Amino acid sequence: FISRFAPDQPRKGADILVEALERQGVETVFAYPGGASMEIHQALTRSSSIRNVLPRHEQGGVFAAEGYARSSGKPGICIATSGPGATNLVSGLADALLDSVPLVAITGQVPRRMIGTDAFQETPIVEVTRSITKHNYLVMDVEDIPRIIEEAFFLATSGRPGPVLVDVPKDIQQQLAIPNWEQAMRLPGYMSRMPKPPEDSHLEQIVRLISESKKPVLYVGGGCLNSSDELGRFVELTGIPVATTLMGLGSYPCDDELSLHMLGMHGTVYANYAVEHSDLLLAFGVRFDDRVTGKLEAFASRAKIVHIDIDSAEIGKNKTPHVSVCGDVKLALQGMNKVLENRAEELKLDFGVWRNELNVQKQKFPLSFKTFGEAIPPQYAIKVLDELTDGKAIISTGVGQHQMWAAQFYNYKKPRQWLSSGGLGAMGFGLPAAIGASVANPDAIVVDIDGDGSFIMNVQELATIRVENLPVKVLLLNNQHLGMVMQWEDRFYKANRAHTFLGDPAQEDEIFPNMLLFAAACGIPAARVTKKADLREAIQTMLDTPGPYLLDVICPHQEHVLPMIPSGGTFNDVITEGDGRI
Amino acid sequence: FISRFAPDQPRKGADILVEALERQGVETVFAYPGGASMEIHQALTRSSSIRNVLPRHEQGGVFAAEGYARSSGKPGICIATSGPGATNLVSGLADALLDSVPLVAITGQVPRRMIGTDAFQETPIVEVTRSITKHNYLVMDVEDIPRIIEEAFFLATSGRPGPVLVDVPKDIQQQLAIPNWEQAMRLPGYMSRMPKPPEDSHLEQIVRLISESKKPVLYVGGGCLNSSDELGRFVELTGIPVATTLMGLGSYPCDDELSLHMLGMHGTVYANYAVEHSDLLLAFGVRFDDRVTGKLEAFASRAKIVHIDIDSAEIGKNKTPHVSVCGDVKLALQGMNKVLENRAEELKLDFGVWRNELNVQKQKFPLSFKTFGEAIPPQYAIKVLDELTDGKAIISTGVGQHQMWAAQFYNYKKPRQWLSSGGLGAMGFGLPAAIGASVANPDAIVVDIDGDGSFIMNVQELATIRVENLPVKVLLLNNQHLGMVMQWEDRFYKANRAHTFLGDPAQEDEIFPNMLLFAAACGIPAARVTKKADLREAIQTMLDTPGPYLLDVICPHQEHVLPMIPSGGTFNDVITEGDGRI
Numbered sequence A, B: 001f002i003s004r005f006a007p008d009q010p011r012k013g014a015d016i017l018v019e020a021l022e023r024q025g026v027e028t029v030f031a032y033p034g035g036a037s038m039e040i041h042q043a044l045t046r047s048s049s050i051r052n053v054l055p056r057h058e059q060g061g062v063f064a065a066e067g068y069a070r071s072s073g074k075p076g077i078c079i080a081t082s083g084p085g086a087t088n089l090v091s092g093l094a095d096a097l098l099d100s101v102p103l104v105a106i107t108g109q110v111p112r113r114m115i116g117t118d119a120f121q122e123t124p125i126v127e128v129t130r131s132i133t134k135h136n137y138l139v140m141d142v143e144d145i146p147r148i149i150e151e152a153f154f155l156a157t158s159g160r161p162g163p164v165l166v167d168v169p170k171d172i173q174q175q176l177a178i179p180n181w182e183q184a185m186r187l188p189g190y191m192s193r194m195p196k197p198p199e200d201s202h203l204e205q206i207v208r209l210i211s212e213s214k215k216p217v218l219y220v221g222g223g224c225l226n227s228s229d230e231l232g233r234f235v236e237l238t239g240i241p242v243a244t245t246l247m248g249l250g251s252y253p254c255d256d257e258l259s260l261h262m263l264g265m266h267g268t269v270y271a272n273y274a275v276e277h278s279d280l281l282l283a284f285g286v287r288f289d290d291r292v293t294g295k296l297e298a299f300a301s302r303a304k305i306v307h308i309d310i311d312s313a314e315i316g317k318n319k320t321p322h323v324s325v326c327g328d329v330k331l332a333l334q335g336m337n338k339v340l341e342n343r344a345e346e347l348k349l350d351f352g353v354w355r356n357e358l359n360v361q362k363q364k365f366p367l368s369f370k371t372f373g374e375a376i377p378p379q380y381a382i383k384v385l386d387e388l389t390d391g392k393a394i395i396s397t398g399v400g401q402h403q404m405w406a407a408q409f410y411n412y413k414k415p416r417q418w419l420s421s422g423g424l425g426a427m428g429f430g431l432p433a434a435i436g437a438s439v440a441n442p443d444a445i446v447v448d449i450d451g452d453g454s455f456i457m458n459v460q461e462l463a464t465i466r467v468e469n470l471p472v473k474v475l476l477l478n479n480q481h482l483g484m485v486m487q488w489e490d491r492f493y494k495a496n497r498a499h500t501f502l503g504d505p506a507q508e509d510e511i512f513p514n515m516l517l518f519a520a521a522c523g524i525p526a527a528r529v530t531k532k533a534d535l536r537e538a539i540q541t542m543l544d545t546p547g548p549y550l551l552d553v554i555c556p557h558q559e560h561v562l563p564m565i566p567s568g569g570t571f572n573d574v575i576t577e578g579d580g581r582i
Ligand SMILES: CC1=C(CCOP(=O)(O)OP(=O)(O)O)S/C(=C(\C)O)N1Cc1cnc(C)nc1N
Pocket: A398, A399, A400, A401, A402, A403, A425, A426, A427, A428, A450, A451, A452, A453, A454, A455, A477, A479, A481, A482, A483, A484, A485, B032, B033, B034, B035, B036, B081, B084, B085, B088, B121
């Protein structure tokens, strides 16, 4: 590593922190400047390897860092000033923690001598973010910067990945010092309980259970994002069907005959059927979240549960397993793969009768949508995008109906193609997320499947897309409503509208606001499409036009995401029919 | 009070909470719906007295409630869903606490049985907001709703006003119960240390000090917002000049001969002079914040300090006073006014020599600006707005250069005409704040003096302005930069630009983005003005056109806010000359 400073020569704390980032392999930050972080931004300009993407609001900054992180496997880095800068990161951090996204957040702070005095732009950010980050730090000495950054990146990326925040007082940024880069990390506790490689004692007991079962199911989630090859090989050696959580899409290719697609509340009927009637549940890298389980005692009630997780706090949290393995699923699969490879003819595994039993359910209840006259079905739009991009686009989304359809109707080949807020479910995620994805993946098609409710929340980032000259494609499914809330309104509150309409009550038939004009304000080419016939061409034009593009897709507002298990329900409660129409 | 329910008849917790609001005199909420707050929104629709203004992002919601609160003296109410809804309020709460703004925030939460399980859209909001609210609550029983709401509004509005958050679990919203409205508030500690009326022992000692002083100064702040009459009478009985904090503008009319205008870092030279050389400092409703004091030992170092504050934790926090009074400044002035009225001829007060000494400073160093050819001076634009509105507009602002000029160059007659984020200094405040102001004041001219950096952050609220048909006027001082950061960049970092340019580096002379097109997207009439000559007419057109209006005012980017005391400095360090030019 080549420094920009002599080994014996003092420099500012701000300059130490930036070098600390360079030494971690950081190439991009998302930083919005302010009083308490100016020094860091000054140090940033004199770096040649780190580029800064300036957002227009710091919530854009964080979600952009998440996009960056989710679409690459690298940690996302964002920087903010004290006070209002810092607090605007809060939703992103909470989002990153719940979805296990590696993130390092750096915030400026008032000078140390003023911490606690309610100074200009002061917020006890360490206090505020304690329950919503993996860990955080207040830097109280310039001597500590090398050690804290190293710890921050280590903690953020190791074990169960998560957000780490580092608060840096202005006077520390200014203090001249000589950094020492060979300090030991002060993480003795965390480091002592980092999971060991799985030994064969546990792994052969699982292969034993597989060979003894008649109806096995793979329940696969966000823990498997780095184990696509391993899981691939595991399936071809067992022939066990694969259900997936929303966070796990793409781990196993959605367009394969062994794929049961997504399970859960808006999961496919056949996936939930498989899990309902399975005798062996192989839960790899999941957290038995309420959205997939529903009522707990009814979830895989006839199943022998095997649960592999890198977090011990997750094992036996919601459903208590029969067999458990604590550690990396990649290694567990690698180990299980060898056992299955060696004893292949010794086992002669055949799950034909079970796989077939599922194949009839896949036909009796496949994913379906209605086409009404010339109106665009949102589902069909996503199918056309899938066909035209050849299933190879990076997709980010907002939250709601459109998010579920983007999950249901696009066929993700690899993981890290699907970027979405699952745990927290934060609106205004898709657009800034797309920015991060595109900066991390300069040669890939990046499409933000967004809703008009979500899109508008962080519309200011269209300024960012244009200025940063990024080829973000926006497929806006415009249905004039907060659809997800409207669906629940329709089915539980006698269709009584409670502030879910997003258009203008005066001109109730006019599309409002005009999303094309937002795009024009930022010099981004845009088109609107209303007839289904024009769709195939409109989307093709979006893809072909160089640089950013917005396509406003008008959809009938009364479509419903199906299937649906009402919250806290069972597989028997599954709703497969109906909409907000007549 | 007429209820919508029989006294003996059960109803939902959601319906109890809404009635609790009606019983408090609530007429407006700012609420964005979601999964965990649907029930509240359903209960809201069946209320006939409370209207809901739906924002497009919940940070808009909070700042709108702040606008409402700041421009009326009533508490502002906002409602949000769990998780991402709740976290998006965070900047508003922190803002409201630092500026002492009465606010009640209600958030939905996951059902009680799931608190702590990282459920769908769960955030420990009570944990997160503890250090940034006056108080908060987790409701654990439907029986507690009447008592908690009453406590919430009491705490939010009594003593030193502030934000209070009430977290309400979904199952509590659904539970049927019969509310009891006569419960005693469980605030024995808070209620026992609520300040008593000031007795004459203290007040005559102050009048004694006034008559003994030769160079007295009134240092007046946000504590005086409800004491404009009392302070008015106090001045006409003493003839003591009035300096003001940013939060206190309008308490004493800026356009009066006894007014020293604003003091502090961007305060007038004569105001800071007065305070520097005063022998008696009358600090009424201020908090000796670093922005006005600078280096503490040098601030009024020759002055006898009298400090009246409703918060005992503020008295002797930063500067230790000689004499102090703990309580309401309105009552203290009322008491002091009688003493001064009775002993008028007995004292024969005359501060001519001191007032005159200040009058020469007011001439030697008045507020000034340069006009460059045909380009618009931002200062002059605000002067024209002042003249044309007759000084009677409600003004909200973003944060930065434009905020200081809106403070310096508009002459506020009454308090609660000036709405601005002072303590936290949050960008994207001016626009949603204006919405709250206009909903609270349907017949007043409401103008948001905003900057292009700040404006874009919450540009989505233009959808809100239009749909809610509110006559918000937006005077956008567009200088293509984060000006305040740029000014500091110019004077401390050799003009080295560190991510402060907001336009497009490709088309560097084109105004970017096009703010008129944002306004058009939301069907809001808009015009751009570049030549100074067209300004008088452009602004007049903004005022005359019914409904919302945006005026894009182009300004040379290298203007500097003056005067300026570099942070942590003295009156001797005052900078009165220069800009970002040649
Ligand atoms: C408004 C809303 C939703 C509607 C989103 O509106 P959209 O128009 O963006 O998406 P669509 O459903 O119509 O396709 S879904 C939802 C959930 C699942 O909690 N919420 C509540 C919600 C409210 N606020 C934020 C920041 N995030 C949220 N998820």
